[PDB]
RNA sequence: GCGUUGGAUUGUUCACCCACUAAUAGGGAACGUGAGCUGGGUUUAGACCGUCGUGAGACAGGUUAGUUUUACCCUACUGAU
RNA sequence: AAUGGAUUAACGAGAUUCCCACUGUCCCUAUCUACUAUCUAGCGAAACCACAGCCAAGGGAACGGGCUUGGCAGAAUCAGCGGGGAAAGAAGACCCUGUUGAGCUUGACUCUAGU
RNA sequence: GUGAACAGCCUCUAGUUGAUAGAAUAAUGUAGAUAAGGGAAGUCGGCAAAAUAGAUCCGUAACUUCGGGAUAAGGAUUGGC
RNA sequence: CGUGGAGGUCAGUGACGAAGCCUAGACCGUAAGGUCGGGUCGAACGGCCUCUAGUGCAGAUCUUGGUGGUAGUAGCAAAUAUUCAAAUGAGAACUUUGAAGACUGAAGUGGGGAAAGGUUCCACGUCAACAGCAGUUGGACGUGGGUUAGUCGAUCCUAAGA
RNA sequence: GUCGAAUUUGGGUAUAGGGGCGAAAGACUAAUCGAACCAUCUAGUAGCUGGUUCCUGCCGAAGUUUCCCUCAGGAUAGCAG
RNA sequence: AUAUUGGCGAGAGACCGAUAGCGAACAAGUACAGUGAUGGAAAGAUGAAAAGAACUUUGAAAAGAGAGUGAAAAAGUACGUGAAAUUGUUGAAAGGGAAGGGCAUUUGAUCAGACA
């Protein structure tokens, strides 16, 4: 448990986590802001075009 | 055994975070070495290239 | 020249395992151990070495015989056997 | 060194039998504060000095 | 204790750029070496005015 | 406004010729310009000759040999979205 | 003038001057290749850091990124660059002090093994 | 095998095919080159590069401790059948 | 005014929540600081009259530990060089076989040893960490297997010397 | 540069800190040498540098005298509580 | 009668409470460094009791989500409480070559007391 500051109805919501994942931190932030607030089925088509060099993840910070 | 084989993986985690390559890698590093910091190297024969 | 290429030539031991103390300090060319005074009769110790005696005085070993001396005194160095009262 | 003494070979035997991880049944005992073998030795890492 | 804190063989290094003058524990390999000693502010040192 | 050089002898600027040219004007910018270059000369430790000293050594002095090595940072500037 | 002086064949990674041969050292710059730099996937440090970053003038620990009066001033940034940031390698190799040393010398003082 | 040769280049036995890779081909670099005409005018200074190079025949100066100098210098030549 | 311990007292407070901590919520004092509410937390602790000290930190190129900007940047450019299919697997520029291209070119990137190392040799299993990319592979991790002498050495002899 | 010897090198052994060893540079003696490293005396001494931890109230200075191997400091007088 | 930082057995404290006290509350003169003489750390705390998370579902796997044990998973063998530097996400505000500060008020948010 113990999620971040969330404002939603916990009945109609699922969730997932990953701990201790050996990635880069600065890359996983920018690829998570690029997908935030999107429709989920548009999100999964989006990430499959990132691997094919069609649409790119923007780096903001 | 599944009680005992999971505890060998609980008790391994502290060495893996310090990237110890085993239970026999106990390489203790000096806090400060002498030959980097103790010297005044002026005109003349110097302490390295 | 005097550093990392001259450290490649180091493959001849000066000291080996001692029989009295087992310390790897028995110097070969002198036939004498620099830590435990061997083969002289007196074990090497000095009063400038304060930690040097705390590593090698009594009680650090097993004490195969001294650990029973303070018990045999308290009964009075008695002989014979028990009674079965 | 392939021409070793028996005084030298007698100490490699003790170094081989100390070269083992901790037994899995000592994990389970009462008031076990022993977790990992800490005097464990590798040949690549730490020389044992004869 | 009358010898508490002095069970150490430290020595000053000298006047470089990136180091102070507090006498440092000589030796190597242990991770205690290269640390401060004999000071009242040093970790592992004696206190000021050891009580009698 | 525009233009004021090419060479010859010493680390050398100092000091002075040769020829061309329309003319070979004078200065400043930490006696512009070493984290641009140069180490030629300026300042260690080696060594010789000369003077002085009983001596270690110093020189009125001469000759030769010789280690300081970023830039990826913000600004400036030249370019680019 | 064996504190050694004059001479000289041969030899020298020793010091200096010139002549032929030769050539992008130069007049005067041009071009080609490899590997970098550059862009991407994975991996991913260090020096340094009071606070930080646009200039002119004035005063001023004697030559301002900040003070005072002016000129100005539009987000976010990529590749070059070496003017400045008294950027950085050295509580300075330079010069004075201390009733601080060490090494070396002599009919300095006080002694000492030896003879 | 070439060759005076255990030089250098190429292959058989035996052994590896490991060293972060992809895409582009700006500057400035690092390593290696070629340049018309002139030929040290460059520079503290011919630094660096270029030129000479193996072998056979001819030829070879001052100087000298007679041994050297000497590969002195300078020329003619080099395949295949 | 505040901190650690001491004697006294308030028959002080407390598992119906003591101490600690967080708190652009409130109150008192010029100020050192004191008090209250809310949040978390789980076992002790405060007022006052006095007694004692190892008692108040921003600095000492302070000491030990922890973390930043720099920065997803410098970089990972010596030793001529890799490529196609298949197998295995969740996943292959890197593993195995085959096909092909090259090198060390025998003063080897070959085959044996002395010094030194001490199980690295070999098999089965197997990938969290390590191999500055990767990994199903390994000198890594887990469990085992393995070194056979009248003739080779040591043992014996003497050298400089101890 | 030198490359048949004043050559190069393995193992054995000898010399140990005011000592060794040196075809001589004050060289070398375990990344340390114009006197090795280790521990103790030791918390050596500094007339020199740096730091010194809570608040408010009241009063509030001196760079001058004479003496000192005294001139980056003391003793005395003055000023202050 | 007097001496005692050693040995052996006991009793204590206006002493220290894990950077403190011996170097060592822990497999400490241990790990590790050095040819050698010698040098020498770091590291205590789940709960009353392991009752240490059966089973289901997604995933190659670690794990995730459910479920469940307990007074509590805001205690899950990275475990009592869990501060700061530093960082993520959500909400509010500002931003023409720094930022922060003093006096004064507007605008926004937020909040205590009292009327008898």
Outline the structure in words:
Chain C: This is Large ribosomal subunit protein eL37A. Chain C: Its cofactor is Zn(2+). Chain C: Keywords: Cytoplasm, Metal-binding, Ribonucleoprotein, Ribosomal protein, RNA-binding, rRNA-binding, Zinc, Zinc-finger. Chain C: Belongs to the eukaryotic ribosomal protein eL37 family. Chain C: It holds the Pfam family Ribosomal_L37e. The structure is cut from a larger assembly and holds chains A (61 residues), B (49 residues), C (85 residues), D (50 residues) and E (52 residues). Chain A is built from two helices and no strands. Chain A is globular, with a radius of gyration of 14 Å. By secondary structure, chain A is mainly α. Helices cover 33% and strands 0% of the residues of chain A. Chain B has 49 residues and is mostly helical. In chain B, 33% of the residues lie in helices and 0% in strands. Chain B is rod-shaped and about 70 Å long. Chain C has helices at residues 51-54, 69-75, and strands at 15-16, 26-27, 32-33. Chain C starts with 14 loop residues before the first strand and ends in a 10-residue tail after the last helix. Chain D is an all-alpha fold. In chain D, 24% of the residues lie in helices and 0% in strands. Chain D is built from one helix and no strands. Chain D has one helix at residues 6-17. The N and C termini of chain D lie close together (11 Å). Chain E binds six RNA strands through residues 1-9, 15-22, 25-33, 35-39, 41-51.
């Amino acid at each position: 448990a113990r999620y971040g500051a969330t404002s939603t109805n916990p009945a109609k919501s699922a969730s997932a986590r990953g701990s201790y994942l050996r990635v880069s931190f600065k890359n996983t932030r920018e690829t998570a802001q690029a997908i935030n607030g999107w429709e989920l089925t548009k999100a999964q088509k989006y990430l499959e075009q990132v691997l094919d060099h069609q649409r790119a993840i923007p780096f903001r910070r | 055994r599944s009680k005992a084989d999971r505890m060998a993986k609980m008790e391994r985690r502290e060495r893996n975070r310090h990237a110890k390559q085993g239970e026999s890698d106990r390489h203790n590093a000096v806090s400060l070495s002498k030959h980097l910091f103790s010297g005044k190297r002026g005109v003349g024969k110097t302490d390295f290239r | 020249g005097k550093g990392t290429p001259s450290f490649g030539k180091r493959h001849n031991k000066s000291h080996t395992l001692c029989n009295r103390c087992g310390r790897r300090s028995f110097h070969v060319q002198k036939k004498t151990c620099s830590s435990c005074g061997y083969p002289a009769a007196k074990t090497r110790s000095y009063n400038w070495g304060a930690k040097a005696k705390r590593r090698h005085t009594t009680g650090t070993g097993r004490m195969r015989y001294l650990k029973h001396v303070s018990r045999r005194f308290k009964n009075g160095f008695q002989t014979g056997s028990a009674s079965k009262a | 060194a392939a021409q070793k003494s028996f005084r030298i070979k007698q100490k490699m035997a003790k170094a081989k039998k100390q070269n083992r991880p901790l037994p899995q049944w000592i994990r389970l005992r009462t008031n076990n504060t022993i977790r990992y073998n800490a005097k464990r030795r590798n040949w690549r890492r730490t020389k044992m000095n004869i | 204790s009358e010898k508490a804190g002095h069970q150490t063989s430290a020595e000053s290094w000298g006047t470089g750029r990136a180091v102070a003058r507090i006498p440092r524990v000589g030796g190597g390999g242990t991770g205690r070496s290269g640390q401060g000693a004999f000071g009242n502010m040093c970790r592992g040192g004696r206190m000021f005015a050891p009580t009698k």
